[PDB]
Amino acid sequence: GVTLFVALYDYEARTEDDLSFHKGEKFQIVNNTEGDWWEARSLTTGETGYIPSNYVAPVD
């Protein structure tokens, strides 16, 4: 199903393992079966790291 998500809000990373992003930035979800921090790849930067799951929603 849909594994592409979009940021609903801007986010500035605290720790090195988090991605910073802007509203509208898209992500390919790598793993969301762990906690509420999801592993994801930014479609803008190509980087992979962790994002707060309640900041994103599926693109469709």
XYZ file of N, CA, C and O in Angstrom:
240
model
N 0.803 -1.220 0.000
C 0.000 0.000 0.000
C 0.841 1.278 0.000
O 2.003 1.287 -0.437
N 0.286 2.386 0.484
C 1.022 3.652 0.409
C 2.135 3.694 1.433
O 1.876 3.740 2.645
N 3.383 3.765 0.954
C 4.595 3.902 1.785
C 5.264 5.250 1.654
O 6.355 5.472 2.229
N 4.646 6.168 0.893
C 5.105 7.523 0.700
C 4.274 8.437 1.571
O 3.033 8.447 1.493
N 4.960 9.184 2.419
C 4.328 10.054 3.394
C 4.777 11.493 3.177
O 5.814 11.758 2.551
N 3.942 12.431 3.688
C 4.214 13.855 3.530
C 4.160 14.520 4.891
O 3.330 14.182 5.717
N 5.072 15.450 5.107
C 5.153 16.189 6.351
C 3.976 17.157 6.441
O 3.682 17.897 5.518
N 3.311 17.153 7.593
C 2.226 18.058 7.880
C 2.688 19.314 8.567
O 1.956 20.307 8.569
N 3.902 19.292 9.099
C 4.461 20.333 9.936
C 5.964 20.366 9.703
O 6.567 19.351 9.376
N 6.562 21.523 9.909
C 8.024 21.623 9.963
C 8.556 20.920 11.184
O 7.876 20.837 12.220
N 9.806 20.418 11.126
C 10.422 19.777 12.303
C 11.918 20.006 12.253
O 12.551 19.778 11.209
N 12.508 20.461 13.380
C 13.939 20.672 13.516
C 14.496 19.583 14.419
O 14.035 19.419 15.556
N 15.453 18.830 13.915
C 15.952 17.655 14.600
C 16.702 17.998 15.882
O 17.455 18.974 15.960
N 16.445 17.176 16.897
C 17.167 17.266 18.158
C 18.491 16.524 18.037
O 19.564 17.116 18.067
N 18.407 15.232 17.808
C 19.556 14.359 17.748
C 19.976 14.061 16.311
O 19.216 14.188 15.341
N 21.201 13.618 16.217
C 21.811 13.317 14.907
C 21.036 12.272 14.107
O 21.015 12.320 12.855
N 20.313 11.356 14.791
C 19.605 10.288 14.057
C 18.233 10.690 13.517
O 17.619 9.881 12.835
N 17.781 11.928 13.759
C 16.557 12.470 13.252
C 16.793 13.291 12.015
O 17.839 13.919 11.864
N 15.800 13.284 11.136
C 15.797 14.196 10.001
C 15.071 15.492 10.379
O 14.092 15.474 11.090
N 15.586 16.613 9.882
C 14.830 17.869 9.884
C 14.039 17.930 8.599
O 14.479 17.381 7.588
N 12.891 18.563 8.630
C 12.126 18.636 7.379
C 11.169 19.798 7.435
O 10.877 20.348 8.502
N 10.623 20.121 6.269
C 9.612 21.125 6.139
C 8.276 20.498 5.805
O 8.206 19.487 5.132
N 7.225 21.236 6.126
C 5.891 20.843 5.672
C 5.901 20.609 4.158
O 6.450 21.416 3.386
N 5.288 19.526 3.714
C 5.290 19.188 2.298
C 6.374 18.213 1.853
O 6.228 17.570 0.788
N 7.474 18.122 2.603
C 8.532 17.200 2.254
C 8.010 15.775 2.290
O 7.278 15.373 3.200
N 8.440 14.971 1.336
C 7.944 13.613 1.205
C 8.977 12.628 1.718
O 10.185 12.859 1.663
N 8.478 11.458 2.145
C 9.362 10.438 2.688
C 8.944 9.083 2.215
O 7.750 8.786 2.150
N 9.929 8.242 1.955
C 9.701 6.811 1.755
C 9.908 6.143 3.092
O 10.979 6.260 3.678
N 8.887 5.462 3.579
C 8.993 4.827 4.874
C 9.809 3.566 4.721
O 9.522 2.737 3.854
N 10.841 3.451 5.536
C 11.695 2.288 5.607
C 11.216 1.314 6.672
O 11.088 0.115 6.407
N 10.865 1.824 7.859
C 10.334 0.987 8.927
C 9.421 1.789 9.847
O 9.866 2.756 10.481
N 8.142 1.372 9.938
C 7.229 1.988 10.900
C 6.556 0.966 11.781
O 5.433 1.184 12.278
N 7.239 -0.141 12.041
C 6.711 -1.195 12.893
C 7.459 -1.286 14.201
O 7.316 -2.270 14.938
N 8.274 -0.288 14.491
C 8.986 -0.201 15.750
C 8.182 0.747 16.634
O 7.037 0.457 16.981
N 8.732 1.872 16.989
C 8.029 2.821 17.829
C 7.276 3.876 17.030
O 7.009 3.730 15.827
N 6.958 4.983 17.718
C 6.346 6.099 17.039
C 7.351 7.014 16.412
O 6.965 8.036 15.878
N 8.618 6.658 16.414
C 9.591 7.315 15.553
C 9.867 6.356 14.397
O 10.316 5.219 14.609
N 9.572 6.792 13.207
C 9.645 5.924 12.040
C 10.938 6.130 11.300
O 11.391 7.267 11.153
N 11.504 5.074 10.756
C 12.679 5.225 9.910
C 12.208 5.557 8.490
O 11.380 4.838 7.930
N 12.804 6.568 7.882
C 12.313 7.077 6.611
C 13.422 7.720 5.807
O 14.423 8.189 6.353
N 13.240 7.734 4.505
C 14.143 8.391 3.575
C 13.462 9.615 2.989
O 12.450 9.478 2.365
N 14.077 10.764 3.145
C 13.596 12.003 2.527
C 13.768 11.907 1.019
O 14.864 11.621 0.529
N 12.701 12.176 0.302
C 12.763 12.238 -1.130
C 13.436 13.537 -1.640
O 13.859 13.596 -2.792
N 13.609 14.527 -0.801
C 14.384 15.708 -1.143
C 15.872 15.488 -0.954
O 16.646 15.793 -1.842
N 16.328 14.957 0.218
C 17.753 14.905 0.490
C 18.402 13.567 0.197
O 19.629 13.494 0.102
N 17.622 12.493 0.108
C 18.128 11.172 0.037
C 18.601 10.604 1.342
O 19.039 9.429 1.364
N 18.557 11.379 2.421
C 19.065 10.879 3.702
C 18.036 9.965 4.332
O 16.836 10.218 4.241
N 18.516 9.019 5.118
C 17.642 8.172 5.924
C 17.859 8.421 7.400
O 19.011 8.490 7.867
N 16.761 8.558 8.118
C 16.824 8.719 9.551
C 15.438 8.653 10.143
O 14.525 8.090 9.577
N 15.306 9.127 11.350
C 14.086 8.925 12.084
C 13.270 10.188 12.048
O 13.814 11.316 12.108
N 11.947 9.978 11.963
C 10.947 11.075 11.965
C 9.819 10.791 12.955
O 9.423 9.622 13.203
N 9.245 11.833 13.559
C 8.136 11.640 14.484
C 6.866 11.359 13.691
O 6.442 12.173 12.855
N 6.262 10.170 13.924
C 5.207 9.663 13.048
C 3.997 10.566 13.017
O 3.298 10.622 12.002
N 3.714 11.303 14.108
C 2.538 12.140 14.071
C 2.763 13.437 13.333
O 1.798 14.198 13.209
N 3.923 13.665 12.754
C 4.157 14.805 11.885
C 3.878 14.491 10.405
O 4.086 15.368 9.548
N 3.504 13.271 10.083
C 3.392 12.878 8.681
C 2.062 12.200 8.430
O 1.372 11.673 9.346
N 1.699 12.170 7.165
C 0.519 11.459 6.731
C 0.774 10.865 5.361
O 1.591 11.365 4.594
N 0.063 9.792 5.010
C 0.266 9.179 3.667
C -0.117 10.155 2.596
O -1.072 10.921 2.732
N 0.600 10.094 1.472
C 0.295 11.023 0.387
C -1.044 10.739 -0.258
O -1.604 11.615 -0.919
N -1.568 9.532 -0.142
C -2.871 9.203 -0.596
C -3.447 8.095 0.289
O -4.629 7.846 0.176
